[PDB]
Write a protein that binds this DNA or RNA. Structure first.
Ligand SMILES: [Mg+2]
Lengths: 145, 319, 219, 79, 225, 48, 50, 221
RNA sequence: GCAGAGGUUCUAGCUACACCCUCUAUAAAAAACUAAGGACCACACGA
């Protein structure tokens, strides 16, 4: 209820904002192995700046292209490390957010439709697994590198 | 009864206040409830629905059709005709349920996919029949679980229910790109039993012309369901600019894995049906099918895989 | 009490002649499964048909071998042969030769007639040749069998699919003629190698089944 | 009969304007005497509108220009 | 009785009041579906005011959850009975053992998805032999309150209704005992002063087992009363 | 479908007519809420 | 004790027997478990819920 | 092909027999056995009771003095009796009993054609000295199971669920035959269980006609 | 058929959500037909 009601005023009101800001998506490490690879962490989101492979000044992925399955598969074989992506927080749209700053609908294989309420979608997605939650040296290298 | 008596502010605040009891969410007409039934014969675009429930919910539609066809001159006579449940009324009812979606609705609608549209299939009985695949999306059991059915009235309502709320249109959950209609409990067990192998099983070793020959051998009973046999398959790949190319090869596999090959659409490769095919493997299969073929082929493939999983789990006898 | 709701054909979707989908709407409760399983078994395990059973390569005696100039192993060569749909006349057995050389695929139309033997798929591919000096020649043995005889139950031995059917799958759902009980609605999808029409094959299977109960019809 | 509206939403890439345009089409079919251009197969108005959109001959632009022309000959009816 | 149990079913059935336990031993002089007569033994009866025991088993009676509290005799004529013994199998009771449900053959295997996750598949044989047919007694009570401009009558004169509906009702407007009414039928004819007759709820059906009428003193009772 | 009296009557007449057209109107629950908040002594009204 | 009780009758000591399909007519592989378990019928009938 | 024949009919018991069909080849055995079993269990013309009227019992749930059990248990016992008729499709059975003693089916005042195959089947026990029960049992032929709630007058008429199904347990076994000189021939033995209202030979012969007629959709007779 | 009354039935029937015909101050040749009310607190149970 709290999640839905802090939301429900946020809908996709625009298609783009031309904002270069965003969040640098990096695979999360909490001391152990890769909990979530970058392939499954940036999938379906539109980048903010051109990603580059070890070769410098290389436009591997352009600035404002949605990262579908093909782009993510290309990212893995090019061995990318951190990809800057357009975050909904960084969006400067008033009374809503633009489609590019949000990304894939996560229910259809395309960019989010201009208008679709994503605040309620996000609130329900967060609150649904609430019933499935719970209530209560030295540094050693793991592999070659 | 020595209790605080409700004031002019106790009816504007709280769960029982006007806001959250009568404005935020309010009771509705054209609504009915019953326990739910599996009914595997259905397709996820449709659901079973009792005759009494379709008669009561669609009473205005039946009255309108009766007036249009002149069976009853007046609403009053038509209402009496609906009470008599005359045979002509059922034929009229089948006309108003041809393409009229209804919103299946479980009580704890935690997320977006809690309520989904369905084309009602008139069934005799008193229990709503819910497609097996969407039970995971609904988080719905078959242990007395009841879900309400709502009838969209206006063309806008029915049309947007068909375009958005249909289970065919809800394959990937809003939380994550992973499919939500994935084979969950029994069909996955049937597929897992189907896609295995004995090191020595009946009818192991001979080469098979194709999946049709594998089905012929299994049904005839002269070859075990899971025996390591080489088969010839026409694997289709769309590596071209949308065109599907055909690759024919003798891939070593089992009879059971060859059975599933006729189910999968053309675009999918054979490397996805050549494993034990657990829950995670089937989820990855459905995700690849959605990302390659699209939506309609994914729906048809999900229905066919549900059918085969149920049938060969029944044939398995996994006690 | 002996009266029954005999089914009547309503719509038989005629897919290409190698495939068909026959359905019946009325029928009876529980009779859809009975008829579907009876037809499936009766035409999938015992049907008078002709298919290859034994092949002999002039230059090859052991299965674990391969000729030079052919990209397909003789293991795969027999795989094409077992799918060669052949129809024969009153003769119960005939030897078919495939003397051919030169670069190019060896279509089934190159099989010597050896009488009035008919091949329903002249364009069927058996093997491919890539060398001008390469020549392929084998003798094909076919008999009018009555079902399926795998090679594991018995010179190159190839699985013999005598029955002309390739796939049978009956789906039984509900059909309510007028307003009675949910009677069975048998729909049967059939694929045939091509020797006979799938409709004709189903009719032949039903004739066999009824002809199995000639003494049980109360005169 | 129809099961999914995928090809329709590749035709109209909004998934929301599609509902509005097909609802206007269904309204024209029901309230008006408009004849659906695709012949029905014992189908309701709400699904035959989606069938019309599927073939690509009916969308917001064609519907708008068609109703505009009808209004034009509505002024021109009385000369 | 359950084929597999715990042995406390007899204790639960005897301790509970559903069954008709024998307070004194003896022999069954006369047994009937509505009454059981027990002839107390000479060594188990008092010198004075002993006589013999008579048990009036409760027949089909409306329960709190609209079920039948039925007591069927468990003994025949001449069967010896000891003290503290079971005599009538009450509801969900067989031979003095608590018999809640009804055991039957159960096969643990998936079946074409009709038992997909937790659903149960039931054969036609179960329905045929009435293993789970349960009698439900409904309490449809009609009240005739005081009304302005005169009270309302209970007679069979109801306007704007057909004779077919009134056929079940008697001459005084009360449904005949034993009549098999259906959904939407009329049971007792009550008309308000100027059509408020009690009617069977839609869907539910069944046969009336008894019609009891309570009338306050002062107002004359109708023919059915 | 829930509380608009004029809306409910119009919707019923429309469906029996065959034109599944919604006459929106306004929920009467909102009018009840407005009257209850006004009765507290808090003028809550609508601009035209 | 249960195994000995099964052995007392003609039934196998394993507790599960081969069952033939009702429609297809050929036995299910991996013999399934059968038995007479006492199962009730709760008062939550569907008739009440419509 | 080969034609199965009524080679043997082993009437092992009064209720259930063991019919034998001799000539069958690969598949035929199991196919024909399963088809016959499904036809028998699905639709066999029985003659179960469908309607009962008691002399002085108003409805299904009442109770008359002198009877051991309820009228409902009397009706359920009546459903269990096995009765077969020859000429009439409809017959009314009158049961008049007096005095102490179980009311078995043997005392039913049967007509010329209708006869009870299990006279020992008890219906009710009379207990009082001056206790008499007079019931008019209505027995009619039918196919399958039709309940009393899904059919189609006086208040005194009692409806009992119809159970038109002579067969209760059909088991078939496919085993090799003993022909003079041949292999790959199996004999089909069917262990059909009946209540006694149908002859196993005529039951099997009827099941084949029903299958043959249903088959006639694709085959000219 | 929009403001009222009458008609062949059955006190009364004028679109009351409501069913047929007449006209603007007058009552009958005519068959299918009729009714528009209804909260809170506790208990137990299901998911
Ligand atoms: Mg549950």
């Amino acid at each position: 209820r709290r999640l839905v009601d802090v939301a429900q005023d946020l809908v996709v009101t625009e298609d783009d904002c031309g904002t270069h800001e965003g969040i640098m998506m990096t695979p999360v490490i909490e001391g152990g192995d890769v909990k979530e690879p970058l392939r499954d962490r940036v999938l379906g989101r539109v980048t903010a700046e051109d990603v580059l492979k070890p070769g410098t000044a290389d436009i591997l992925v352009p600035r404002n292209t949605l990262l579908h399955e093909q782009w993510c598969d290309l990212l893995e074989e090019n061995s990318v490390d951190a990809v800057k992506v357009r975050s909904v927080v960084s969006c400067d749209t008033d009374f809503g957010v633009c489609a590019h700053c949000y990304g894939r609908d996560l229910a259809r294989g395309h960019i989010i439709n201009k208008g679709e309420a994503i605040g309620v979608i996000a609130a329900q997605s967060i609150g649904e697994p609430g019933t499935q939650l719970t209530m209560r040296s030295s540094i050693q290298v793991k592999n070659k590198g | 009864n020595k209790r605080p008596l409700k004031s002019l502010a106790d009816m504007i605040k709280g769960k029982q206040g006007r806001f959250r009891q009568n404005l935020l969410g309010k009771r509705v007409d054209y609504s009915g409830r019953s326990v739910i039934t599996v009914g595997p014969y259905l397709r996820l675009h449709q659901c079973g629905l009792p005759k009494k429930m379709a008669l009561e919910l669609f009473k205005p539609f039946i009255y309108g059709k009766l007036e249009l066809r002149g069976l009853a001159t007046t609403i009053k006579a038509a209402k009496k005709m609906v009470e008599r449940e005359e045979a002509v009324v059922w034929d009229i009812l089948d006309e108003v349920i041809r393409e009229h979606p209804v919103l299946l609705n479980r009580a704890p609608t935690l997320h977006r996919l809690g309520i989904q549209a369905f084309e009602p299939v008139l069934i005799e009985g008193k229990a709503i029949q819910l497609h097996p695949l969407v039970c995971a999306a609904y988080n719905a059991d078959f242990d007395g679980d009841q879900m309400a059915v709502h009838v969209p009235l206006t063309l806008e309502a029915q049309l947007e229910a068909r375009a958005l709320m249909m289970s065919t249109n809800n394959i990937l959950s809003p939380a994550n790109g992973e499919p939500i209609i994935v084979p969950s409990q029994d069909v996955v067990l049937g597929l897992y039993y189907m896609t295995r192998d004995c090191v020595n099983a009946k009818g192991e070793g001979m080469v098979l012309t194709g999946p049709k020959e594998a089905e012929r051998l299994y049904r005839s009973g002269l070859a075990s369901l899971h025996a390591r046999v080489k088969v010839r398959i026409t694997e289709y790949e769309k590596d071209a600019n949308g065109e599907l190319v055909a690759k024919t090869s003798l891939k070593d596999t089992t009879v059971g894995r060859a059975i599933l090959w006729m189910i999968v659409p053309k675009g999918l490769p054979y490397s996805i049906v050549n494993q034990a095919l657990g829950k995670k493997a089937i989820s990855k299969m459905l995700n690849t099918c959605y990302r390659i073929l699209g939506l309609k082929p994914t729906v048809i493939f999900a229905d066919q895989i549900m059918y085969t999983g149920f049938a060969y789990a029944a044939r398995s006898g996994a006690s | 009490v002996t009266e029954f709701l005999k089914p009547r054909l309503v719509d038989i979707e005629q897919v290409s002649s190698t495939h068909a989908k026959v359905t019946l709407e009325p029928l009876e409760r529980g009779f859809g499964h009975t008829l579907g399983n009876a037809l499936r078994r009766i035409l999938l395990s015992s049907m008078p048909g002709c298919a290859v059973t034994e092949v002999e390569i002039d230059g090859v005696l052991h299965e674990y071998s391969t000729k030079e100039g052919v990209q397909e192993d003789i293991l795969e060569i027999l795989l094409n042969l077992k799918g060669l749909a052949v129809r024969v006349q009153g003769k119960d057995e005939v030897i078919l030769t495939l003397n051919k050389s030169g670069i190019g695929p060896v279509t089934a139309a190159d099989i010597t007639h050896d009488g009035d033997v008919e091949i329903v798929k002249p364009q069927h591919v058996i093997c491919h040749l890539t060398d001008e000096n390469a020549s392929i020649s084998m003798r094909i043995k076919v008999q009018r069998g009555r079902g399926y005889v795998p090679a594991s139950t018995r010179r190159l031995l190839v699985d013999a699919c005598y029955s002309p059917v390739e796939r049978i799958a009956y789906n039984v759902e509900a059909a309510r003629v007028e307003q009675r009980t949910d009677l069975d609605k048998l729909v049967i999808e059939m694929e045939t190698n091509g020797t006979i029409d799938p409709e004709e094959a189903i009719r032949r299977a039903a004739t066999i089944l009824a002809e199995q109960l000639e003494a049980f019809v109360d005169l | 009969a129809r099961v999914t509206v995928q090809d329709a939403v590749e035709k109209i890439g909004n998934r929301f304007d599609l509902v509005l345009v097909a609802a206007r089409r269904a309204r024209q079919m029901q309230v008006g005497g408009k004849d659906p251009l695709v012949p029905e197969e014992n189908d309701k108005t709400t699904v035959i509108a989606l069938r019309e959109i599927e073939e690509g001959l009916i969308n917001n632009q064609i519907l708008d220009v068609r109703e505009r022309q009808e209004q034009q000959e509505q002024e021109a009816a009385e000369l | 009785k359950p084929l597999v149990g715990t042995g406390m079913e007899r204790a639960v059935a005897v301790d509970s009041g559903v069954t008709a336990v024998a307070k004194r031993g003896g022999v069954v002089q006369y047994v009937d579906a509505s009454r059981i007569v027990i002839k107390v033994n000479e060594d188990e009866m008092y010198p004075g005011e002993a006589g013999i025991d008579i048990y009036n088993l409760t027949k089909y009676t409306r329960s709190n959850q609209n079920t039948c509290i039925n007591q069927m005799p468990c003994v025949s004529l001449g069967e010896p009975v000891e003290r503290g013994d079971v005599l009538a199998d009450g509801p969900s009771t067989d031979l003095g053992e608590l018999a809640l449900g009804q055991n039957m053959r159960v096969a643990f295997m998936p079946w074409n998805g009709y038992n997909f996750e937790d659903s149960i598949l039931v054969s036609e044989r179960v329905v045929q032999e009435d293993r789970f047919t349960t009698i439900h007694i409904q309490e449809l009570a009609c009240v005739s309150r005081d009304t302005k401009l005169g009270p309302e009558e209970i007679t069979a004169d109801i306007p704007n209704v057909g004779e077919a509906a009134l056929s079940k009702l008697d001459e005084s407007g009360i449904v005949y005992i034993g009549a098999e009414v259906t959904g939407g039928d009329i049971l007792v004819g009550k008309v308000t002063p100027k059509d408020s007759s009690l009617r069977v709820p839609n869907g539910v059906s069944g046969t009336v087992i008894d019609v009891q009428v309570f009338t306050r003193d002062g107002v004359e009772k109708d023919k059915r009363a | 479908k829930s509380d608009d009296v004029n809306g409910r009557t119009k919707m019923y007449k429309n469906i029996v007519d065959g034109n599944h057209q919604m006459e929106p109107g306004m929920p009467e629950s909102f009018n009840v809420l407005l009257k209850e908040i006004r009765s507290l002594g808090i003028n809550i009204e609508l601009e035209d | 004790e249960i195994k000995e009780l099964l052995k007392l009758g003609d039934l196998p000591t394993s507790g599960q027997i081969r069952l033939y399909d009702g429609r297809t007519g050929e036995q299910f592989e991996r013999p399934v478990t059968v038995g007479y378990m006492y199962m009730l019928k709760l008062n939550h009938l569907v008739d009440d819920k419509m």
